[PDB]
Amino acid sequence: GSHMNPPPPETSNPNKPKRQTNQLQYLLRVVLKTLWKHQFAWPFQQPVDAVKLNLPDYYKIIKTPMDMGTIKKRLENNYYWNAQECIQDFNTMFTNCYIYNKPGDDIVLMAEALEKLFLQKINELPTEE
Ligand SMILES: CC(=O)N[C@@H](C)C(=O)NCC#CBr
Structure with missing residues (x-):
């Protein structure tokens, strides 16, 4: 939790309206599930720790x-x-x-493998019910 890394993106905010949809359920149960257990998922399973990786320019470049x-x-x-x-x-x-x-x-190459799986799954995102 180095002060030189930014705070992570928001994951909780009571002011933001929330809704469960069948499409969001699919994203968790099918899409996220598929990508999380991929051999190449691990660099993407947490925020980039630019201090640990000695990449001080990361959050100068990547603003989102x-x-x-x-x-x-x-x-x-x-x-x-x-x-x-x-x-x-x-x-x-x-x-x-x-x-x-x-x-x-x-x-x-790792991200491209995950994105290929992602696109296959998102092409099948179900009609909003
Ligand atoms: C998610 C992501 O882009 N992670 C990056 C920062 C990473 O691990 N760098 C590989 C190299 C060398 Br220089």
């Missing part, structure tokens, strides 16, 4: 951080109003990785 630990908390503590908000958090996580890291890099 997101990770699957935060998404999991948001889904489990239903923070979201709709599926689009959660889909945007996944998209942000992937795009941050591709912006910060070189296209060669192991971390980018």
Whole structure:
């Protein structure tokens, strides 16, 4: 919990209206479940600890951080109003990785594997019931 890392994204706020939808249930039970247990998930399971990794420029570059630990908390503590908000958090996580890291890099190949699974699952996101 270094003072040099920012506070994580919000996962609890009583002022924000919340709703359970069948699409948000799918995102937790199918999408997050699938990606969390992937061999390459672990770099994405918590906020980037730029101190531990000796990357002092990370939060100079990435101004909208997101990770699957935060998404999991948001889904489990239903923070979201709709599926689009959660889909945007996944998209942000992937795009941050591709912006910060070189296209060669192991971390980018890991994110691409997770994004390929993600796209397959989101194409099947159920009709809002
Ligand atoms: C989620 C994410 O982008 N993590 C990054 C910061 C990471 O682990 N870097 C790989 C390298 C070397 Br320089």
